[PDB]
Amino acid sequence: GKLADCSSKSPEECEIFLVEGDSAGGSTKSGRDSRTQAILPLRGKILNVEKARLDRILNNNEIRQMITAFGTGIGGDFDLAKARYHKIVIMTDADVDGAHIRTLLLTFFYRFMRPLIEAGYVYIAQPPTGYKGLGEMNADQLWETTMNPEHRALLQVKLEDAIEADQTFEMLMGDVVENRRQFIEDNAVYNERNITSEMRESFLDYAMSVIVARALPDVRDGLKPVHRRILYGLNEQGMTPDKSYKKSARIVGDVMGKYHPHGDSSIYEAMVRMAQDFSYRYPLVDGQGNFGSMDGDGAAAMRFTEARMTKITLELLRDINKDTIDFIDNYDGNEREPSVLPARFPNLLANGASGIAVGMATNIPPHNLTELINGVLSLSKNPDISIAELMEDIEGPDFPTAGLILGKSGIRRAYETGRGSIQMRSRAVIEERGGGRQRIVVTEIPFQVNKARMIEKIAELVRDKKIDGITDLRDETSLRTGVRVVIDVRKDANASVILNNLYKQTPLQTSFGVNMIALVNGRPKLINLKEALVHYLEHQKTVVRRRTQYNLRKAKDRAHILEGLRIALDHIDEIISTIRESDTDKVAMESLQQRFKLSEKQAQAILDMRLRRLTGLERDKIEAEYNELLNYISELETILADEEVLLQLVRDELTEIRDRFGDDRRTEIQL
Amino acid sequence: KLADCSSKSPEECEIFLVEGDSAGGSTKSGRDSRTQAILPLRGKILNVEKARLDRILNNNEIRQMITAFGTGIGGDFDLAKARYHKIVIMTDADVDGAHIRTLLLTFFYRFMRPLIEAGYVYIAQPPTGYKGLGEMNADQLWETTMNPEHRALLQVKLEDAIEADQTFEMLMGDVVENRRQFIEDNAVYARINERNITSEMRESFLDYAMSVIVARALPDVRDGLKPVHRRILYGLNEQGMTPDKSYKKSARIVGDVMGKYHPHGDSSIYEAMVRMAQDFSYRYPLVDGQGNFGSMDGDGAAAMRFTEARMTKITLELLRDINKDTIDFIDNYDGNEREPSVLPARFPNLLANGASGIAVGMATNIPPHNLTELINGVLSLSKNPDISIAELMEDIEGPDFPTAGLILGKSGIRRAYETGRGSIQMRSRAVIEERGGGRQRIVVTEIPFQVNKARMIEKIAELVRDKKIDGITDLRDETSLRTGVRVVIDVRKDANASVILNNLYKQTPLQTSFGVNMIALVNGRPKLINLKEALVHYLEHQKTVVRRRTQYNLRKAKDRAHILEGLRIALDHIDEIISTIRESDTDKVAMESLQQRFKLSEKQAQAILDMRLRRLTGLERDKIEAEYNELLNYISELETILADEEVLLQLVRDELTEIRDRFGDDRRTEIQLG
DNA sequence: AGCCGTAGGTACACCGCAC
DNA sequence: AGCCGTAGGTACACCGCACA
Ligand SMILES: O=c1ccc2ncc(F)c3c2n1C[C@@]3(O)CN1CCC(NCc2cc3c(cn2)OCCO3)CC1
Ligand SMILES: [Mn+2]
Ligand SMILES: [Mn+2]
Ligand SMILES: [Mn+2]
Ligand SMILES: [Mn+2]
């Protein structure tokens, strides 16, 4: 019994608060009136009774507890006269996931306790916004704002149209995705309460948020918010590859407070993935300690592990503090975070992405960096280049885990339409092992296949006699010798027939279903290969142009400051007189401007100069910096005057990155 | 569960026992899977010396080890059935790891003795400088620790059976006193092949016992803190998380303390901070919390992602003058940070907030006190070092719990203050009142210190259900933010309510005793102290802190005067100063020329070069003269203080008195006599 | 039918001492 | 007994989509 009941046993005047868990529950319990206010803390996202089978709804803990608590029974054994509270209040947290949970609770109430809604017994609390959850609020401010009958504003759930309600719960919570997807495309925007309205607004609120700020990557830098924030945090704390490894608990703590208002496990595990050479084609995090295995083992707890950027991540961040990309307010207006990273290499395609969102998902495979940039260079020289033509550069996916791809037709379809099915195979050979016996040796497995689960799958077949010919199965994999899975073949059995069966019946062959959905200008979009590169190139141009414009403004400010110091150096004797005959700093300022026709800034810079700056070498430093800066100023203006020069520079910086980080193709494309 | 090897030839097969999956992950990635099995355990294992058999055989990890080894236990042990000829204990390289090792060896000795006698039990030797094996890369762990070509495993040898029996009895057994005795005789408060089991258990257990005694479970007498709380407060100070500054995220606080100062689990840090923010736990709260921070009904805090914290105004006094060389700093656990050995502690925190701790061989239980009373005691002591405990009791009347209530009698308090030990009877505040129709009720508005309210309610509800008390018709917790604590016991019409109340005191936590046991760290050793010793040590701390501060401010003032003498010379002769700089090509030359030509020290010459041109304005020459004159008065004031001990002691009195007037409050707990 | 990866959520074993 | 408070350790419920 999680239920913290009230004293009074008079249902007319008793109410029950459904909260997300004990973090909310505590604040709730501390602030309530225990005479008339019961509390039932749940455990987060409840079951979707619209998608779930009947037997499993009834065997579900929180469903049981809610029913037990209400005292009515369910569906047809629902007696409204046995109800123990005339007020059932949904008080989930005031975030998108709170709205989602409320829709899930409503789905449950409408399907199994419909008459409870019809009796006007179901209510929605209205906690203040700007709180991640109720546990973040003090007890008194939760009582006054949300729970005190004297000041609270509860919304009574009313049911208007029964037909229309049915169509709503089926559409939003039902198993058919397309209908949901259609609702989101049609409706997306980039103190009674109608149940139909609440469902539609709450779900859209959740759907949208998961679509544009959680599960789908941005086309420009290929990142989800969590990754973008982990990387930015690493940048902000000077956690570069030349520095030592920093503790993960601080990385996580920092990202969670400043940028990512969600649980630590989502953050830590997203970071861990980026450090794994079998998950990321070009790892983004350089980890120290236990960071997981291909066998599905998780990483060590965050208190043990350490991390920093890889050298390549520096290229994601290069020039972020040179006004290249737009910054936005963080979740609470106390911080600033990047909307997008500079992304000086085409990361989306390089590393790919997979996200399960709402009404849609995404699945992009990784690619070879040498080939992608070559692709970008060709597009840059011909805006009208066909997909076929791009594919002379980018042969197909290139998986961190190597392996084989069967044929080109799936790739082609996927590059042209954004969708397509790519068959992946393990790299396997047949060899002798003595006495006329043979074995199969696997040294590379498909992308995202759990090796230990794959081995168990084979063993299970052996055992069930669903496959013939295998006498032994060993995972000889080693840190020192790499992946090595050995399948011994029964004497005189065709091992090639056995190998073929394994590809038919086990993850030893696996398909990658490409479904290339990314955020293009804030909206989810199914894109082909060209579109993906087009948006990327366009982003590289804005980055380098904005960088060049930044460096200019700053060069011009510094030259202006140096012009002041040189005037000063030229008339040093007269500059001293002016300052020495002045009572206050303000008087000296005004006099320096008047005597030598200096700006307010130049005068300040002169007054701030130390006596040290009068030594021979220091005087020469000022002159030397000034001459170097004039040459730099025109170098910048030249680039700004000519579009082709700019684009050329985007080409030369991409090339430089290709030469330094480009590497061999790993996945073999068999015809 | 077990991650077994390929081969089933036990002669060449080995099993590694690690503390959990963090360690096991690195171990499984680095191992030779042909001959090396891994059994990850789950932290501290059951101590079999203290447990009966039914408890042992139902412990999951014991069972998994038994099943893994395949030999059976006790009388049914069969060495021939061993699945591995090397059992390797490879716990983390920290004191808790040493402790887990001692627990496993205890188990092996009592249940698998022949396993040790055949030389099948080994101890791995992972490098130190790592919290757990999860901190290591799989290759580093293989090469230094598991690889048979470079590793240095320690084979456990049983030399003398009689002596090992006694060793397992003493160190792991239930008679605490012998363990305490063992620690006292051996505590110093300053490997290739074989390893005698007895030595291993002695050195490993002492290492853990010592570490828990001096650096975990016991408070320091000077500032009244344990390492975790000290590092929390220091953390809050270092990031300027003061009362006037906004609330800071708990996750940020904890991650920082965990990273730089306290190399342990997040739980221990957060939950410690949480307690410091609880007005029913701390007589004077050290942390100011925003969000769900728990309750007297035992509700924990909200998860740390939700809560935010900062220091209280009174914690600033714990930290006052910490950056004025008042206390000794030490290296952190890894050498990358500095941390304070002790806080200046400008109020008697040990006694004010109290402490309770379970250590090894000993424990501690010190109740909290009223700050006004404590300071007046301290002041009385400072004017009479020959003051008796009884006379000190005219200032300090007894403990004063954050939860208020009543204390029964003074004799318990007296014994506690005289000896360091004593039982103090604590009672709830309860009244009897009418409720209508000739019926009465008991109403409890205050409960004993460290009693969980809801649990006390459940124990009363249990009594009535079991009919081991009569006259109670109803029981409600009416506690509210508006009302305060209010527990109601409705009595049956015409039943004597006082007799019921009296039974409730005897049969439930409604009256609890506080077993005073005043053990604190004095000069880094655990010591049982009385009330006078606690004050005396605290006052000597204060005298040291104020003395060191005054010495610091004097070195600081004397340095500044010396700079200003060089700035006066410079400004007087500024034209010559400028020409000297201009004619100098480097700083090195400019330094050298200013020092000779103007009779300046290296520090003064540097100060002049660092001087900005704005510093040459007309009214600066006077501003510098005024500062220098005032520094000479200041230096004279400070020397006057260091010259006379009584002026220093008075200075301590004055600051303590100021603390009292600002932070001192009324007594909460009533001491009823008889 | 189960798994991929970002999300909401919480529980329970063990050590130590003392009364 | 089992509870006070620093320590070691880790697991399992839920949503959402698409593909075998
Ligand atoms: O292993 C198990 C097995 C079963 C189980 N059943 C229930 C339950 F609740 C739990 C369970 N657990 C663990 C757990 O306690 C849940 N954990 C609570 C603490 C969370 N991390 C705290 C944290 C640490 C930080 C930080 C932010 N947050 O920021 C930087 C500094 O370090 C992680 C999840
Ligand atoms: Mn929530
Ligand atoms: Mn450990
Ligand atoms: Mn009692
Ligand atoms: Mn017992």
- How many whole angstroms separate alpha carbon A485 and alpha carbon A465? 20
- How many whole angstroms separate alpha carbon B424 and alpha carbon B367? 10
Residue A413, SS3?
helix
Q: Is the CB of B254 under 6 A from ligand 1?
A: yes
- The whole-angstrom distance between residue A245's C-alpha and the CA centroid of its chain comes to 23
Q: Which residues contact B212 (CB under 8 A, 6 or more apart)?
A: B95, B359, B360
Question: Helix H segments across B219-291?
Answer: 227-238, 250-260, 266-276
Closest residue by Cα to the C1' atom of nucleotide D14?
A45
Residue of B nearest to A136 (CA): B291
Polymer length of chain A? 671
- How many whole angstroms separate alpha carbon A609 and alpha carbon A168? 71
Distance in Å from C7's C1' to B67's CA comes to 39
> What is the DSSP secondary structure assignment for residue B90, as one 8-state letter?
-
Sign of CA dihedral A613, A619, A625, A630: positive
CA distance B426 to chain A (A): 26
Q: Which fold has domain A1-188?
A: Rossmann fold (3.40.50)
Interface of A with B in 565-584 (CB under 8 A): 572, 575-576, 579-584
Closest residue by Cα to the C1' atom of nucleotide D9?
B43
- How many whole angstroms separate alpha carbon B528 and alpha carbon B522? 9
Contact B174, A511 (CB under 8 A): no
Residue A370, SS3?
helix
Q: Which residues contact B508 (CB under 8 A, 6 or more apart)?
A: B456, B459, B460, B463
Residues A130-133: contacts with CB within 8 Å, 24+ apart? A130/A94, A130/A332, A131/A93, A131/A94, A132/A93, A132/A95, A132/A261, A132/B305, A132/B306, A133/A20, A133/A23, A133/A24, A133/A93, A133/A94, A133/A95, A133/A98, A133/B302, A133/B306
Residue A125 Cα, ligand 2 centroid: separation in angstroms?
14
> What is the DSSP secondary structure assignment for residue A668, as one 8-state letter?
E
Q: Is the CB of A252 under 6 A from ligand 1?
A: yes
Residue B529 Cα, ligand 4 centroid: separation in angstroms?
28
CA distance B123 to chain A (A): 22
Mutation for B interface: A141, A146, A272, A303, most B CBs within 10 A: A303
Contact B413, B558 (CB under 8 A): no
- How many whole angstroms separate alpha carbon B668 and alpha carbon B402? 7
Contact B48, A313 (CB under 8 A): no
Would you list the domain boundaries of chain A?
Answer: 1-188, 215-671
Residue B60 Cα, ligand 5 centroid: separation in angstroms?
20
- How many whole angstroms separate alpha carbon B603 and alpha carbon B610? 11
Q: Is the CB of B302 under 6 A from ligand 1?
A: no
Name the nearest CA neighbour of A82 among A8, A1, A5, A11. A11
Q: Identify the burial level of A281 via C-beta atoms within 10 angstroms of its C-beta, where 0-12 means exposed, 13-18 middle and 19 or more buried.
A: buried
Residue B30, SS3?
helix
Kindly determine whether the C-beta of residue A43 is less than 7 Å away from any atom of nucleic acid strand C.
yes
- How many whole angstroms separate alpha carbon A171 and alpha carbon A180? 6
- How many whole angstroms separate alpha carbon A7 and alpha carbon A61? 24
Name the nearest CA neighbour of B203 among B131, B49, B95, B41. B95
Sign of CA dihedral A443, A445, A450, A452: negative
CA distances (Å), origin A498, targets A262, A463, A495, B209, B240: 48, 15, 5, 61, 68
Residue A609 touches chain B, beta carbons under 8 Å: yes
Q: Between B22, B264, B477, which is nearest A290 by CB? A: B22
Check A138 against B590: CB less than 8 A apart. no
Q: How many CB atoms sit inside 10 A of residue A608's CB? A: 11
Name the nearest CA neighbour of A129 among A105, A145, A144. A145
Residue B610 touches chain A, beta carbons under 8 Å: yes
Q: Which residues contact B349 (CB under 8 A, 6 or more apart)?
A: B223, B224, B225, B318
Q: Is the CB of B18 under 6 A from ligand 1?
A: no
CA distance A165 to chain B (A): 36
- How many whole angstroms separate alpha carbon A80 and alpha carbon B246? 49
Name the nearest CA neighbour of B121 among B81, B73, B89. B89
Closest residue by Cα to the C1' atom of nucleotide D18?
A361
Backbone angles phi and psi of B611, in degrees to 5: -65, 135
Radius of gyration of chain A from Cα atoms?
32
Give strand letter and number of the nucleotide nearest B20 (CA to C1'). Answer: D9
Residue A129 Cα, ligand 2 centroid: separation in angstroms?
12
User: Atom 26 (ligand 1): residue with closest C-alpha?
Assistant: B251
DSSP string, B135-176: GS-HHHHIIIII-TTT---EEEE---HHHHHHHHHHHHSS-H
Contact B270, B254 (CB under 8 A): yes
Q: At residue B137, what is the residue type?
A: N
Give strand letter and number of the nucleotide nearest B360 (CA to C1'). Answer: C16
Beta bridge partners of A515: A363, A419
Q: Would you state the torsion angle of the CA atoms of residues A142, A145, A146, A148, taken in this order, to the nearest 10 degrees?
A: 100
- How many whole angstroms separate alpha carbon B543 and alpha carbon B346? 10
Contact A287, A275 (CB under 8 A): yes
Mutate to test the pocket of ligand 1, among B42, B254, B261, B262 (most ligand atoms within 8 A of CB): B254
Instruction: Write down which residues 108-137 in A have CB closer than 7 A to strand C.
Output: 133, 135
- How many whole angstroms separate alpha carbon B121 and alpha carbon B156? 6
Beta bridge partners of B426: B407, B512
Contact B296, B306 (CB under 8 A): no
Opening angle at CA B451, ends B445 and B455, nearest 5 = 90
- The whole-angstrom distance between residue A651's C-alpha and the CA centroid of its chain comes to 29
CA distance A239 to chain B (A): 15
The tokens for B243 are: 């009362």
Beta bridge partners of B185: none
Which value in Å is the resolution of this experimental model? 2.6
For A379-390, b/e burial (b = at least 16 CB within 10 A) is bbeeeebeeeeb
- How many whole angstroms separate alpha carbon A366 and alpha carbon B416? 72
Beta bridge partners of B356: B365
- How many whole angstroms separate alpha carbon A237 and alpha carbon A255? 10
Distance in Å from C18's C1' to B267's CA comes to 25
Contact A645, A605 (CB under 8 A): no
- How many whole angstroms separate alpha carbon B22 and alpha carbon A249? 15
Sign of CA dihedral A518, A259, A290, A44: negative
Residue A298 touches chain B, beta carbons under 8 Å: yes
Residue B670, SS3?
strand
Kindly determine whether the C-beta of residue B213 is less than 7 Å away from any atom of nucleic acid strand C.
no
Residue A48, SS3?
coil
- Tally C-beta pairs within 8 A across A and B: 236
The tokens for B45 are: 């294992």
> What is the DSSP secondary structure assignment for residue B194, as one 8-state letter?
E
Q: Which residues contact A67 (CB under 8 A, 6 or more apart)?
A: A73, A74, A112
Q: How many CB atoms sit inside 10 A of residue B494's CB? A: 9
- How many whole angstroms separate alpha carbon A212 and alpha carbon A205? 11
Q: Are strands A155-158 and A192-194 parallel, antiparallel or unpaired?
A: parallel
Contact B291, A131 (CB under 8 A): no
- How many whole angstroms separate alpha carbon B115 and alpha carbon A299? 33
Backbone angles phi and psi of A247, in degrees to 5: -70, 140
The tokens for A466 are: 């669903």
- How many whole angstroms separate alpha carbon A274 and alpha carbon A310? 10
Q: Between B135, B142, B577, which is nearest A289 by CB? A: B135
Q: Is the CB of A253 under 6 A from ligand 1?
A: yes
Residue of A nearest to B590 (CA): A615
- How many whole angstroms separate alpha carbon B255 and alpha carbon A248? 9
CA distances (Å), origin B112, targets B94, B162, B163: 26, 16, 17
Residue of B nearest to A23 (CA): B302
Residue A407: how many CA atoms within 13 Å on its side-chain side?
Answer: 10
Polymer length of chain B? 674
Class of B1-187 per CATH? alpha beta
Q: Is the CB of A264 under 6 A from ligand 1?
A: yes
Name the nearest CA neighbour of B611 among A25, A562, A609. A609
